[PDB]
Symmetry: C2
Subunit: 168 residues, 2 copies
């Protein structure tokens, strides 16, 4: 019933690949997991699911792909994920760097440059900054890189086992 | 006065780069840290240091560079580190992927192919395989990647802080 793990991801990048594989593995462990899909969430899920999940989950998994900063929902959620961990350092953030160099996540360079250029047309400096600070923070945490040669199912198994053993 | 952190690394690859910076940061926290350099150990240091440190340290940091598997000492030590954490999983292993794809560490491909080709001239299959299994096990753990665009002092600082939090929570 109570949520344990919170997946933050860019739908179009990973919803069918790693994110889904990780979701499946977590269920095999009966870990109650929320999928923060930036495109497919429903209106009656905001309260009963989203806020509760983000409130209850003690483990957050940002699956950060090349299109992650293109989505304002992703950035908004990462910032909130970061804030909540800072309030309650017992909470853990476990980044997955999906087919991006962690350097680009850390400095918002490469594929992320144009996202932030775009957002700066609509949002103020403090909002943009908060979003960059969250990517830097999380980009600097230990995690798993996923590259073109990885067996994503094996990584998913490693990640879910690690999560399961901690949850005890 | 026990060792707390055990650094495993390929000397010629990282001695002057990230390994030193992490050592310096750890030292700023006054964290007692052993440098398992594959070239510069002394014999009086095998007992009262190396073995003491590998025994006492509850955090192992394998800094895995492209020349890591070229060194039999590195491979041997990784296998030991991996054996010790399985024996006592309060211990943790924190891999640094220094200018290598984690993919390659995980599957011992790319730069690591020829290394294992060469060791197979002198060691039997069981021995080679135990070494491959160590790299795979460690390559599959959460850790930090370092690339050419990274500011390694920044990363050293973040690893130090993480290590420090963990030591303190105990
Ligand atoms: Co001390």
């Amino acid at each position: 019933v109570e949520y344990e793990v919170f997946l933050s991801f860019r739908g179009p990048d990973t919803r069918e690949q790693f994110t889904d594989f990780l979701y499946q593995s977590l269920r095999r462990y009966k870990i109650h997991t929320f999928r923060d899909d930036d495109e497919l969430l429903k209106g009656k899920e905001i309260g009963p699911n989203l806020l509760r999940a983000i409130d209850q989950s003690k483990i957050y998994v940002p699956i950060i792909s090349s299109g992650y900063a293109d989505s304002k929902w992703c950035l908004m959620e990462l910032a909130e994920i970061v804030r909540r961990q800072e309030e309650d350092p017992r909470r853990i953030i476990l980044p997955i760097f999906y087919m991006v160099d962690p350097s680009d996540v850390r400095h918002q360079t490469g594929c992320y440059k144009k996202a932030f250029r775009k957002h700066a047309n609509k949002f103020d400096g403090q909002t943009i900054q908060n979003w960059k600070d969250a990517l830097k923070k999380v980009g600097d945490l230990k995690g798993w890189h996923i590259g073109k040669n990885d067996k994503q199912g094996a990584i998913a198994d490693k990640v879910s086992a690690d999560i399961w053993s901690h949850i005890s």
